[PDB]
Symmetry: D2
Subunit: 355 residues, 4 copies
């Protein structure tokens, strides 16, 4: 028997349709109890389970999966979520860590990749699956992707010891800090462009155990509430003026992810480079990520002006890069040099180092 | 209000797991009645519907969809289906044509492409959707593709006027006579290699109305029970001996689909070509299809020996080609030349003619 | 019989290690010496060998100076390229522009708008590896762009790479290392090259022979792109949208949702009141913006970009804002139209 | 310093000429290549006084200098006319010149290239050096073609890397030969390796899957199997295929057959058909079951209760690999039937993934 906590933060999955427009949809648990795929009534009465606890029907193999639904209030559109909301989620997981074997987090798709990346860093030494999921269509609308996404997340978290923050959608389990949202309409909404899925679901369940990170049983969970808030993302576009870059990098900003062209090239006009130099002199740390969905940043852009304050993001998604930068800048009592060293390491499986 | 007939012929979808092995699973209707996504009990009692009739919950838009389940006996593995089984299905649709607005046929995946292709030809002047569907995993197993495939086929047939035999799987609606099975394990089991899907299902339903065939309201449905049975498929492999080809093409064979290499090239060894000439002289009709999943046969192979008795299949799937040949050969009172002309036409949207 | 192209070389990896013409002259696939002497052609003019069908293709190489890394290109560079095409418009049947891949999608999008009523192919191309390195993608990309521009009347600014012809204002760069570097996420390619050449004539735009080419040198320079990220502060958005900015492409989440915190929405309202025009594009590679975000505060000054790439959106905004003597409402109407095949209107 | 290749030209579109919109044979490949700088460095040739049968590639980025000799077979063949004997001849050419060259490139028509590569894979036991097949949809003498880059890439791969396998190089990808199949008759991406990653990819960088590439066994000498059983066939089961036709197909002197069945390995179960398989097994015929599906694997079980161990699962093998392996195994001298069945169930050349 394995018990999960299902944390419902918001998003389309739980909403209601009302005159062709989506509104909030509380009482997820009341709906799930009425669905045989989500709740086995017969086993519940036959075990006299409390009625806050749902029980999945028996699967092919594995142990029986039970879960409790924790509904956050207020429920959020994911576009409104911030570092503080993700910290709250991490603190919920922390508080209930010993009582459950895994966690599923229902989350809006819009910023799910950012949430998964943040939680990935916040939950240091994670020993248990934390699976984010969501849907393009609410579970209360008849024709939807939510039923199978939610069930799959529960089954994965319930049956496998994958000690990572993941995203489950459309029969695929991705490493959370490797995903990005690529399609605003299709059920295949997400992509892990520089890493295989951790798992695939079909007639069989296939898991890339070669990739899945190792449980460090000896070390306790450490939850980082200390995440630097003053980090930003800046997309360089052709002809972007130095004065706009200057304004964007003004105090109190501590870190920025620069999204550059192709293999990591920004404009080389002297007034723009000077603004990057000046920000590095103020102590600002810059991480260079590619605007391209796939591939990697080759080192070199602006290094002759910003020195070691500009760090290559290699093949990281911008979501991962922003999370890592927030994490590293939030660590207490480190030199600048130590921060730069940490940014250049693969801390959670988010970055592939050249071989 | 729109009423559908759901015809259950067999296949994995309806089976049961028993000691890691699949066995037949009758009484589909008794399972569906217990699933809210498939049957709205409240609306059924409130309309005093007979209890052979199921009612889908309300969808976003559209009218209400009701359906009746017709379970064939015996239920078949699709590998054991034949032209006669498909004729039976076409006669079921014929018999109940005026009573229903659409049809869904649950079918095994192994020969679903052949079934869809056959029905496509059998149902001349079809005015209503006939949607085949199935699953890699049975609907009675918890983690499956069957729930969403079956629901999607019902919703598509219930809500849209697509007057074609189609295949619905994994959120995609394909033209039936354009599909082939490409994966024996994944939920994306089928491909329409030389035509876009007719429809895609996501947050929105997208329909390629430019491709969908036109309802000819004036003409009545004509069901072709006269389908020539003595048609075969022959895959040419390198070095295939003339004597084996001779044996394969003996009477009483009337037609054969030859699967040749690349753009339609078979071996040119004289003894093999002579066997094709001799069969053509006996009146055998041959259609040349490519072994390649994608692309088209260029005219020319063996034409200097078999003359007009060897016809290019252009970009047809072999399933479509075999169906069309059975159809054309079964038509009454036609010359050989007329049969050849008909094979070269696009009769059901199965074949793209060159510019 | 004979079709002449101008090959404009602006910079990029393709030509790296000047004098592109001297290399091309020595490559039989690019220059037929025998036909050149037999027709006494001037030696600034190259001649492709005969292709399968079609007429003979001749071309002249115009090398820009200085040559640019594409990351350093700006609206002015693209205007210059448009003026080169304008100047030589009657003398050639098509144009090929060698360009760096980094901003090729932005360049193609800009030229698409600048060249109003274009009647002739303008094909951009480039390479991940220089043509002078033995193992490269440049030879076939360049040849394919010449052959397409030389043999087909596709009156659009296009991008040719890795055997595919895309609509220029529909492309974006998706891979920084592979030869398949570009994607047209919301539109099929205009053409594919294989054993046969397949052209989507159903998509290709119609030549309006009556109307003359009009080149828009009047492109608004004070337009920007702003990527909203979770928790982006209102004060930063305020700073970003200060005068003299006239237009901005906001890149929002999913179907077009930005954060709804009141202080941020207020900054968008305030910019709209200053007359700033905003276009909402999705950060997602694929799909479309649904109308509605911030419309109750910014009103008609915030426009849905539907399925546009951000490159197309920024170009269109520069184009529309540069048009003389239009009301604000007219500018908003134009942004909502499909002006160059860059945007699919719902059906 | 220097690596020497033998380029064996057997036929195919690559070397042909266009004449009135129709392709005819094109001899004297070497005379054309000498005039192309990408294929021949004249300056280095004179400066080293190389014999003029030997071509020299220009210097590449890294690596040693690559020289190659062109051996043109006569007569040149369309690949649809090739047989086991032609592939044996190729294997004997490689054998004869094995010590004089460091690698081999074989120009071959695309139509049966997968069969050729699969055959050579088995014939060349303990291969220590790359044998790279390549070809083109369009002749190298037509201006706009895929042949230049395919041929150059094959030469560069064979010249610069020690991949001791029979491979196929097309469209910037190196596939394991016995894993490929032709999927498109018109596009430059003509081939697919459906159940194995490419061994290599070519872009700005060359990426090689060294984890997959087989290990050079330097101690063991090359053994070339001329002893390949010729009486092996491929039979594609189609719905309703009659027992009498299967009986005719499996008559003596056939020794082995690859049966192509539906989905996960299911053929029709009608008793008269199964009886014909039993009867063939009793005559000593060996049968390998492969899936008609491009992707995925045969699950054991079909017809095993009648044909016993004479019917063997082909798992995820392509039909080309299966036919080659069967020919190889049946050609081995003095083996019991049980031994032959064991060998068919092993991964002998990287063609089959065991569960």
């Amino acid at each position: 028997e394995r018990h999960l906590l299902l944390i419902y933060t918001g998003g389309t999955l739980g909403m209601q349709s009302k005159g062709g427009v989506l509104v909030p949809g509380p009482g997820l648990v009341t709906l799930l109890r009425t669905l045989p795929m989500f709740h086995d009534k017969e086993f519940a009465q036959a075990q006299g389970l409390p009625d806050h606890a749902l029980a999945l029907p028996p699967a092919s193999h594995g142990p029986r999966v039970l879960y409790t639904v924790l509904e956050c209030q207020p429920l959020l559109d994911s576009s409104d979520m911030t570092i503080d909301d993700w910290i709250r989620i991490a603190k919920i997981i922390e508080r209930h860590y010993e009582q459950y074997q895994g966690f599923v987090v229902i989350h809006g798709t819009d910023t799910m990749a950012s949430g998964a990346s943040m939680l990935s860093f916040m939950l240091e030494n994670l020993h248990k699956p934390v699976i984010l999921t969501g849907a393009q269509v609410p579970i209360r609308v008849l024709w939807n992707d939510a039923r199978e996404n939610l069930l799959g997340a529960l089954l994965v978290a319930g049956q496998y010891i994958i000690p990572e923050v993941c995203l489950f959608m459309n029969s695929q389990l991705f490493r959370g800090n490797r995903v990005t949202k690529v399609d605003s309409q299709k059920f295949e909404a997400f992509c892990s462009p520089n890493l295989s899925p951790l798992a695939t679901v079909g007639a069989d369940v296939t898991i890339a155990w070669d990739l899945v990170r190792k449980v460090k049983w000896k070390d306790p969970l450490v939850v980082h509430s200390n995440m630097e808030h003053d980090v930003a993302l800046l997309r360089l576009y052709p002809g972007i003026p130095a004065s706009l870059v200057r304004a964007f990098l003004q105090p109190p900003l501590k870190g920025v992810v620069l999204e550059t062209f192709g293999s990591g090239n920004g404009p080389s006009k002297p007034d723009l480079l000077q603004e990057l130099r000046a920000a590095a002199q103020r102590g600002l740390i810059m991480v260079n990520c590619s605007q391209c969905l796939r591939g990697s940043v080759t080192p070199g852009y602006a290094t002759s002006l910003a020195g070691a304050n500009i760090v290559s993001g290699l093949d990281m998604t911008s979501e991962a890069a922003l999370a890592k930068l927030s994490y590293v800048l939030g660590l207490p009592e480190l030199s600048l040099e130590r921060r730069q060293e940490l940014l250049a390491k693969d801390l959670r499986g988010e970055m592939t180092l050249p071989t």
